[PDB]
Amino acid sequence: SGFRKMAFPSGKVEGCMVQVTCGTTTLNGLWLDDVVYCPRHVICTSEDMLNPNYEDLLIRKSNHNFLVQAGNVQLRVIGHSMQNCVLKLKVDTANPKTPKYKFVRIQPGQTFSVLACYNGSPSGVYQCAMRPNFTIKGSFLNGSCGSVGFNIDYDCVSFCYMHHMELPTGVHAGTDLEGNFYGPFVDRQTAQAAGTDTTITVNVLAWLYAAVINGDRWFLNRFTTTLNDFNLVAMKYNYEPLTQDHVDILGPLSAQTGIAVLDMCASLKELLQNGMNGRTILGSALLEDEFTPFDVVRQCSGVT
Amino acid sequence: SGFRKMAFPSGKVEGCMVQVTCGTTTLNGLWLDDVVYCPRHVICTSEDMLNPNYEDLLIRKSNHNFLVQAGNVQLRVIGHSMQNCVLKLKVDTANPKTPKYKFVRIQPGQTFSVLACYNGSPSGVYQCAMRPNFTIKGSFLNGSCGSVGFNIDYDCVSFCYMHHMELPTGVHAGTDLEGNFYGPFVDRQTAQAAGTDTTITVNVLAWLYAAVINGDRWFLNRFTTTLNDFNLVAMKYNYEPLTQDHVDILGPLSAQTGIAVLDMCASLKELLQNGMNGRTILGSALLEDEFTPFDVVRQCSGVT
Numbered sequence: 001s002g003f004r005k006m007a008f009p010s011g012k013v014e015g016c017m018v019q020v021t022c023g024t025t026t027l028n029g030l031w032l033d034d035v036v037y038c039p040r041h042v043i044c045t046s047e048d049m050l051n052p053n054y055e056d057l058l059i060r061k062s063n064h065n066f067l068v069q070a071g072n073v074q075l076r077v078i079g080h081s082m083q084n085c086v087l088k089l090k091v092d093t094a095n096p097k098t099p100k101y102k103f104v105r106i107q108p109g110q111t112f113s114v115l116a117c118y119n120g121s122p123s124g125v126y127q128c129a130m131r132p133n134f135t136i137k138g139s140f141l142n143g144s145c146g147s148v149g150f151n152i153d154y155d156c157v158s159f160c161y162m163h164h165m166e167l168p169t170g171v172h173a174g175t176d177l178e179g180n181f182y183g184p185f186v187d188r189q190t191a192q193a194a195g196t197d198t199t200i201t202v203n204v205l206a207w208l209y210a211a212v213i214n215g216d217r218w219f220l221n222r223f224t225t226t227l228n229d230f231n232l233v234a235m236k237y238n239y240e241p242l243t244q245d246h247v248d249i250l251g252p253l254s255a256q257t258g259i260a261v262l263d264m265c266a267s268l269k270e271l272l273q274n275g276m277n278g279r280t281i282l283g284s285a286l287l288e289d290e291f292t293p294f295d296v297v298r299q300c301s302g303v304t
Numbered sequence: 305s306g307f308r309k310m311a312f313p314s315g316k317v318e319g320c321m322v323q324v325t326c327g328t329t330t331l332n333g334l335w336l337d338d339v340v341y342c343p344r345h346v347i348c349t350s351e352d353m354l355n356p357n358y359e360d361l362l363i364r365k366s367n368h369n370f371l372v373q374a375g376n377v378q379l380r381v382i383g384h385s386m387q388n389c390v391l392k393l394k395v396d397t398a399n400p401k402t403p404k405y406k407f408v409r410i411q412p413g414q415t416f417s418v419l420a421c422y423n424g425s426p427s428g429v430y431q432c433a434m435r436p437n438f439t440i441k442g443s444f445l446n447g448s449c450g451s452v453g454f455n456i457d458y459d460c461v462s463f464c465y466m467h468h469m470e471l472p473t474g475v476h477a478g479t480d481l482e483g484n485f486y487g488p489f490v491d492r493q494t495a496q497a498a499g500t501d502t503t504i505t506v507n508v509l510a511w512l513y514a515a516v517i518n519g520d521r522w523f524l525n526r527f528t529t530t531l532n533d534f535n536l537v538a539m540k541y542n543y544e545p546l547t548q549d550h551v552d553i554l555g556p557l558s559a560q561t562g563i564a565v566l567d568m569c570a571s572l573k574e575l576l577q578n579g580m581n582g583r584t585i586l587g588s589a590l591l592e593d594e595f596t597p598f599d600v601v602r603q604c605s606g607v608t
């Protein structure tokens with residue numbers, strides 16, 4: 001029992017983190033097999049960041065200009081290519097600690113673990129959600145760029161996020177591992193507003209089922225609702241519209257707890273219309289939306 | 305920028321987790337050098353748990369009764385001793401992945417990272433505080449026993465917690481790595497209430513300095529207070545009394561932010577007397593007490 005904002009064990013990813021220096025810019029790279037993946041802005045000076053031509057900037061760079069250090073041993077670069085907003089640096093050595101891995105583009109509302117790094121050294125791990133507006137609310141200082149997000153299915157690490165920049169608003173933007181930004185963002189130090197962020201409705205309901213399983217039930221009410229009725233409320237409170245797909249995905253928690261999905265929606269409806277009344281749910285004074293239905297099942301069954 | 309409940313990278317500890325089976329009981333062990341540390345209740349049947357004689361129960365057990373498996377390779381046991389509430393199993397092989405490590409007893413209000421394991425397999429990592437009443441609010445299912453808490457200073461892993469049991473209230477109790485329970489708890493399935501838990505005042509103030517650094521300042525007020533005056537409020541709201549030792553430890557955040565400690569206390573005083581007014585601080589709708597002053601400095605400077 002107990003429910004915690006739980007990250008994946010970060011070992012398999014620690015063994016991949018390297019330092020990439022080009023000119024005077026250092027940031028983090030991901031060494032998998034004989035390739036080091038890093039943000040392409042490693043090639044720029046903070047001056048270039050205002051409107052960089054990455055084609056033109058990269059032409060000035062050779063394999064030998066890219067200094068790749070795993071701990072206290074240098075990797076020899078035999079190839080460099082730009083893919084969207086990442087550089088791939090071919091090294092002559094396959095990383096001996098390469099885990100089973102995939103590159104996956106996550107959907108908004110999905111969660112993943114971030115291993116924050118500085119100079120290719122891990123400092124910490126935390127669990128995130130891809131916001132509906134394709135930002136993440138991370139903890140990322142200067143030199144944190146190239147830090148990756150991931151999920152782990154038994155032995156396989158699915159890389160889903162590489163950290164690129166911090167918006168003026170204090171939120172974080174980055175790419176999948178094929179260098180494609182999540183959201184409308186570009187690797188340039190410019191005006192870039194994120195859209196309206198919504199709350200991830202299916203995650204809040206998931207987290208409400210985690211509460212009931214873990215003893216917190218004060219918010220279970222006598223009421224039910226309809227998808228339609230509940231979505232009028234979700235609209236009013238800038239919550240994602242709930243679909244049958246969201247209902248289907250909540251079935252296991254519905255079945256385990258015996259509380260119909262639309263009954264738990266009715267619970268969420270009253271919580272949104274009436275607030276918490278100074279109470280807490282799983283030690284939170286607001287509605288948590290950064291646990292998926294898969295995250296609640298995993299943590300409420302003990303999957304390693 | 306951004307502030308997150310951040311765990312230590314768990315790799316160094318993953319490489320230590322083994323499975324320990326005695327009779328039909330499986331739980332997690334910690335393999336460091338040629339010793340596997342685990343909870344002594346591995347030797348019991350859930351029947352024994354009601355009033356176990358561990359001296360008597362352990363006499364019936366031989367080195368060969370302790371089955372120790374690191375992944376898919378068995379460790380040969382050449383010695384067994386009981387120390388307080390842990391067994392130490394001498395194995396014939398030193399763990400090749402033994403990190404630099406110390407055993408440390410933490411003080412209440414200190415934080416650490418927990419690597420939750422099932423059958424010696426890591427499932428997740430999260431950041432905890434030792435509650436003033438020496439409980440922790442973890443996420444620990446059946447078979448989670450032997451899961452360890454830790455801090456990491458560069459390369460050195462300080463082991464501070466081994467998970468033993470879940471109280472009837474849903475909170476968690478365990479030992480240091482010399483097998484001494486934190487709190488008045490015994491490894492027996494009995495009535496055991498925890499004391500009054502308090503809120504860790506110095507941690508809340510620490511977290512308020514993390515807010516100001518990270519942009520959230522709406523709670524800075526025109527007022528100051530005295531240790532004495534503030535402690536009358538702390539009493540009323542079941543907060544730890546604040547000492548000069550707590551003030552000294554907050555100096556770096558006071559200096560970095562230019563906000564005197566007693567001014568931030570005055571901030572906390574009004575927050576306690578007047579609540580949040582439906583607002584949030586670093587995405588929390590209550591006062592967080594599970595970041596230390598050392599935790600705020602580390603995450604607000606980028607220490608790996």
Ligand SMILES: *CC(=O)N[C@H](C)c1cccc(Cl)c1
Nearest residue numbers: 041145164165166187188189
């Ligand atoms: C990680 C980071 O923020 N790197 C530099 C400072 C940066 C600024 C603007 C845009 C981009 Cl992609 C990167």
Ligand SMILES: *CC(=O)N[C@H](C)c1cccc(Cl)c1
Nearest residue numbers: 345449468469470491492493
């Ligand atoms: C981890 C755990 O809870 N193990 C068993 C179930 C247990 C019950 C009561 C007391 C103790 Cl020490 C352990």
